[model samples]
Target: DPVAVARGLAEKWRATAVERDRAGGSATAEREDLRASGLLSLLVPREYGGWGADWPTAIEVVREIAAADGSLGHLFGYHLTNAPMIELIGSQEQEEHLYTQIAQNNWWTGNASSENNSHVLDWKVSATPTEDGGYVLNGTKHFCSGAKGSDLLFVFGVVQDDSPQQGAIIAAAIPTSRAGVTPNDDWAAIGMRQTDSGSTDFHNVKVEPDEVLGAPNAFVLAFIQSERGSLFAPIAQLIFANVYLGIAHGALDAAREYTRTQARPWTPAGIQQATEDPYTIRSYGEFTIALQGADAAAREAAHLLQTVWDKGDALTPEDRGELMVKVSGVKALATNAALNISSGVFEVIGARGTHPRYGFDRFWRNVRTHSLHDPVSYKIADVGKHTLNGQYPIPGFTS
Candidate 1:
């Protein structure tokens, strides 16, 4: 039933995805549908009102949503990713409090982690401990994806002066409604505009000591080294691959629809129908082959990720590296395919596809915006190293 619900939501949302993208979408109603449909609960515990779906099914749902709306798909994936961060890294007590609140309210969470171009060693935000056993956080974080309409946020900062011994990066879970926390309205990106992937400035915001999700400062290294962090990052990478691939699928589907209904035959082709145009058919043929291959790669990567995820903390670094290789290859392949198909579909669908009302550009824009989540150039290097050298990627944040 949950799976059926997931499909239905994708259909309903697809009908309006382009409209919302044009209107600079809001998540108010979208969030409600997520709650009523129980999609968010797929990975949570059944005891906490979740469906307890496995990794494969959960990631599939994410892919489904992304095919309909990339912005919401992004928000949905990040919510699932961050929602479990506390459980993976927080104290049992923190997990208990947060998961209970999540089950009760169906609250959406967001990330406030990216500081502007600050190297890891010289981070921007500062979280200083108070004598009163609290902390005041002050800094500005960019790319705070999905901050709007979110109830809770994972705010990442660093201690002023530090070594791995002296201090480390800290991510604390805080209420988005907290005083001094501002989710700015400056997200005017051409793609993923509706995600509210803007900036959030934390100006001397106070946080209870208990609210720090894990050991502050130290959590950064631990996050990269820990089983959850190592495995989760790659899993997220694969999901990201599928999201872009799904966007490509959407583009192809739209182009097919338009070609059937609205596209006129090429005047020079001497054809009665657009579908009869040799160039049109050839374009679809080529793009469809690429899409099919990319979709297969994405699905295969998801299966591999799910398998490795099931291994849990027992995964060796070697195991993690092998999983990374598979996922990274899939991610690279999918990224190129998505970009190619999304951009190429217009060629097949012809002039009418470029109409503002059609919004074929949304697919290209969405994939282009998100494809930068990490540079594919670097991902290519990792995959090449692993393939040629028989070395797994040395584990780090990006690996």
Candidate 2:
């Protein structure tokens, strides 16, 4: 039902997708549509006033929306993952309270957790402990997806103190309206423009005790201690796979329309229609096969992930390691298929397809920009090591 709901929304979004992609600004109205769609609560448990859908269902919804616009797809997918953070990492009280509030208010969440660009010795954001057991946050976060319009932000920083927790990483769910929180609308990427994945500055932002997801270093410890805590990494990888696959589907659909109505057959082919051209037909068949293979891989990985997720506390390190291998394989296959199809479709669509008006290039640009989040080369290498050596990836943020 949610996927069908997503299908209708994707159709509506497709109408203005090109124009919005060209505009390259916040998708204010479009995000409102998402909030109103009731799909925001898809992952929350039904007891918390949500649809209680599983990860695969949510991934399918993301894929459907992605087939219309990659930016929204990215935003929507990220929100779905972020929405369940409390359930994944917080106390039962926090989970119950936050999930109920989110579902009731239809709130959208974003994250400002990546500090990859910052030097290893220096943290971009730091928290100073207060006498009341809270903390004051300061500095900036980069590549903050959904930064501009998000109601809630999961912010991560280092604690600046001499105690044992000194330099420990801390995470908090801070509201964007908080006095010192600022979303810098300075994203200027060539693709995924509407994502507004710029930066957010926190200047003396106050964090309450309840706002913190866990104690200092608890975020990292969770990954090391609990298999479920580390699931977010594989979940995010699979989301990328689906988005890439969706872009391929979108490009193929656009090329099909163009070839059917606008493309002209080559003189050497002596064919009445462009679709009848042997080369065009051959390319379509090849692209279809590649996409189907990638789609199958992604679906299989999602299903495996769901099984692991259902295990909860009983999930073992071995179970997670095997699932990660499958997810990494899917990521590699999907990345290749998307890159090939999004760029290759131009071969059949002809010169007119390159025109700015058609905006078919968006599929390639979006995939090109997003797929760089993690290298497919490393994913392949990890899978290869597992295949040849029986090695499992050690638990960490990315691995």
Candidate 3:
């Protein structure tokens, strides 16, 4: 199964976890391992050489890897999200064409989604009208994660407006090797470095008719009115929740091992060993409780999501919103728990833990950077609103 395979790879990944972190996330080996294990096609259908797993299993793989290496986990999780990026309801021919290519080469799908429809500003890329369903793209896309060495790019942009009723939002796919498409190599982020999530400039890239996905603004409307769109935000957030939770586990594991074997007792605690000190035991106990709560929230959300996902378009808006509320609750708890454990672990492990060779600081840096994917404060407010007024957040990025 996907989870078992991922667990094995995670075990191997942990062997070199510290080394990968210190070097700033070289993941060539990890990538190859994933491809060889057929993990690159995990959610792809059986005909396409994948395991044909569902969201629950897919996110579990991400969690396993995140505990081993957060940066790689980020890339892997996003890849799964971007893989089926044509449109929610697609033709079998499109599926066959895309999934077949993906299966044959273990190709990675890149995302050009630094901005969503709800952004304060308009899209960076613009689509120029053309004949035969072809369009010319011009502008820059930032945070194009996993773009490096990718085969297909799922690009989101705006088409020129022609009528009052028409919208400009557009989504399409293009090859990375296309002329006028360039990766700026400008990703300088402190975390998720191996993801190669930077910027891509599309000066005059052309996408043919067959590559276009749906009518203009279809993607934007997908989330508001369609069941598939309703499921999208919550499912995405659940994957993120698991990633952060896994990082929390990694931090706790490291701290526990160090405290047992290396940490020195507080001189004033009147303890024979650091592990025996009430303060030390109290710290671990409190953090474990917090982590457990967060983990429970994540697991519950995942189980609820799986049930709703199987319902397909029949799922009602109310059901979708309720799931979003649950997902937001988990996301809020996971974010706070990870941030706390990643940073708080240092206190119990003490000064020796700061040694560069240990690289314990990486857990803090990785989780700290990734937890900002969305503002957790909003998630807290979302849950509060749902609890007090029976109002779930409106579907959007933060929701």
Candidate 4:
């Protein structure tokens, strides 16, 4: 319920602001303003000085944030996930250390996983064992969302001794106060620029043994099942799906007003008004129907995930097989649907949509940008492999 409250709050965050992602500029003012609204604590518990919501609630909060500002939603996605990691795999001492600090300090943790030059299969960073039995983290992490202002980070790396593919990812929780860690300000994405998802360089940053979460192998396995919540709800694709739909909503709303004022002095046939034009009316019907489908499918996926999660039964092998298919399928569908509906809305408006002042580029930019987070061809291949071989779809993030 508190998560719903978070979503309700984020709605204000979404509806009340303009999406001005001041690229090449500072986000400190906007970031601090977001925090002051108290929506950032939706995931952390009240005991830890947050709302203490579950997976479903967190999903809802993200959707609302996304609907308002794609960058804010992106930032919140990475930031909120920190709550689960801190709660689940952490030691009592770790919990106390984190909870005590975050509760009163308004701290946000950035998630580090990607690298500029490395692929997903190869985690380029390494944690070398120190003479003191701890570790010294050395390497770079790319796409570290919220890196600019986050006080802490969960940095993922690999242990060098194991087989490259078989070795699990180890997440190291590091405080920025520690020496030898530097955030490289190199994020240059057209969308989500406000999130400051830059690269961080760790020049032999030291860490305690407890900083290693779940060892090498288990960490990789556990990270997906525990960390991902998008199997349902408004995840990367769906969140942007809603945003794209909102763009369409804005477009349609604006067009309706435009039709009301058009003089139509050059109208052909017996048409007396612009609103009665066949082209405009038919295109409106077609695009609106498409938007209805996209919105419905997204909402349906969220409902299915919420229902299944609430049931509390451990997923059977069969259940997981079905889940991954649905997740991948719906994600692709949402992406395409957004593209289709928004494209039609633009075409219907013609030159008006092309104008920079109309902000149609922002709509297109957000969907295309978000799609890169999860590949489209990969999804198709996954479906093909699963269908052809009768294979179970391997889980990506959601368990």
Candidate 5:
């Protein structure tokens, strides 16, 4: 049912997706549309006033939306990924309180946990203990997807203190309206420009005890203690895979439309129409097959993930690792299929496709920009290792 709702929304977005991609800025209207669609709480439990959809359904919705607009798809998928932060790492009370708030208010959460900026600076974000048993956070978080219009921010940083918890990784669910939280709106990426994945500056921002998802080091402890807790890593990977696969589908759809109506047959081929050209026909066949393979792999990975997820606390490390292998393999396959199809579609569409009016290049640009989030080669390497040996992928970010 949520998938059907998503399909309707995606068709509406597709109408203006190209213009929005060209004029990159806040997707405030689209974000509102999602909130109104009631899909914002798709993953929340039914008790919390949500649909309580499973992971497979959530990813499928993301795929539908991504096909319409990759940037919005990235934002929506990451929203689903970050929405359950409290359930994953917080106490029972915290989960109850947050989920209720999210479901009732249709709150859109954003992630600001990327520490990639730490390579340039010592700490991307640091938290210092406060006298009121809270913390004061200071630093800038980069690649904050869905930051521009988010109701809540799921942030992670290193704790700085003289206590035993010093240097421990901590996560907090901070309200964006809190003082000293600033979304720079400086996302100037070549693709996925509308994701609002810009830098957020937190200067002496206060975090209440309840706002902190768990105790110091609880973030890492969640991964160490429970295989199910670490499922987010693979879930995130599969989200990326679905988004890429959706982009490929979108590109193919556009190519077919162009071939049927706009594209002209090669003069040397002596064909009456572009669709009659054997080369174009062959290219379409190849791209469609590649996309179908990627689509099947993604669905299979999602089903396996949902099965393992149903195991709850009974999930074992082996189950988790095997799921990771499946997800990584599909991720690599989807990434390749998306990149190839997005770029190769131009061959059949011809030079006219290069024109800004068509905006066909946006597909390639979006896929190319996001594909670099994690190397496809690394995913293939993990899958190959799993295939060659009995080794399974270790749980970590991007694995």
Candidate 6:
């Protein structure tokens, strides 16, 4: 059972030694160091140098990581999804290479879903078969999260020279050291800067025919946006919400712990232990309730995912759409709560939140930046039209 996994990792995550390292410095550096230190192997197969844990256990492991460091937490969840995707979709040789590399390096890898320049929900980046039967890919993939620390990338692009777009989804394990590719500078953003989610450009990059995964008939590219596959996506979204809520809870805990020690700021009218002020009490209660809502929402989403995966039930289109709704709802709710919690926590210690050394603002920046990954506006529009008007944007046939 995952109970033991949960208990053990929760204990490890909450330890002061690990917490000190996570809280002290740059989250990016810590993530790189953590990935390299073999923490990334928690989900990899033991035969492949990983723990070979089950999906439920893997999700719990990520939840533990989230409670410790959101950057590393989010990274772990995304990486956990990748392995299964490859296992399901990759060619035999590709799998051999992937397992070998992960087993050897104890390092993390990332997705390479590059969007063609002309997008509007259209993934048109193409890979052409060369005379020698190899493929040459050229395009841009935006926001390859955890780009710097990734050891390998699983890129997606259409196969060119066909008049109609070949909707192929392949999982090629490409080392990031290949030629004709470069990562942009470290991301400068209001949040999740530690993620380093910069762009990676691919220009006529050659991939051997053997590198192309998902042979004849292909995988059909339904892993993320369709009903046929993508068992982990909802769980991934739940983890995203969990990260924001975890940050909020940490801020809430900080506020509570500091209530007695941190001095009340200079009030214009009269003296008060800011923590006990009526308005302060009201806002704090409200923020705590928001935190509770986030936690509940996250768990609910996780349960939905568990149902789909554990019960062997087919995930309908409605189910996939619900994932988007839950993701967007939590994104909206958690970010809103984070704003209030970040502001209200500073009621007593007003000026101290900004210190780079103190690093309270990481909560703000992280929630804000990561939330931008998928636009809630996009989700809302899709949801509104789908439910109210009985229509869906993408005309997917089947899984």
Cα-based TM-score, every candidate: 0.92, 0.97, 0.93, 0.78, 0.96, 0.76
Models, CA RMSD each: 2.3, 1.4, 2.2, 4.5, 1.7, 5.0
lDDT of 1 at 183: 87
Q: Whole-model lDDT, candidate 2?
A: 0.85
Give candidate 5's error at residue 382 in angstroms.
Answer: 1.2
lDDT of 6 at 264: 70
User: CA lDDT of each candidate?
Assistant: 0.77, 0.85, 0.79, 0.60, 0.85, 0.59
Best by TM-score: 2
Show pairs that collide, candidate 4.
Answer: 14-68, 45-52, 168-216
Model 5 is weakest, by summed lDDT over 10 consecutive residues, at 114-123
Q: What's the lDDT for candidate 1?
A: 0.77
Q: Candidate 4's residue-wise lDDT over 294-368, tens digit each? A: 667666665655555444335344554555555566666666765665556555554644555445555456666
Question: What's the ranking of the predictions by TM-score, best on top?
Answer: 2, 5, 3, 1, 4, 6
Ranking by lDDT: 2, 5, 3, 1, 4, 6
| Model 3 misplaced stretches (Cα beyond 4 Å) | 87-89, 117-121, 161-167
Worst 10 residues of 1 by lDDT: 160-169
What is the clash tally of candidate 6? 1
lDDT tens readout by residue for model 5, 236-346? 889998999988888999888888898887877578877888888899999999988989989999999889988876888888888999999898999999999999999
What C-alpha lDDT, on a 0 to 100 scale, does residue 222 get in candidate 4? 40
Residue range 187-248, candidate 2, lDDT tens digits: 87878889889989999999999988877777567678755677877888888889988888
Error of 1 at 379 (Å): 0.7
Worst 10 residues of 2 by lDDT: 113-122
Model 1 segments more than 4 A misplaced: 114-117, 132-134, 161-165, 223-226
Going through the candidates in order, what is the number of backbone clashes in each? 1, 0, 0, 3, 0, 1
Which residues of candidate 5, in runs, are more than 4 Å off? 116-121
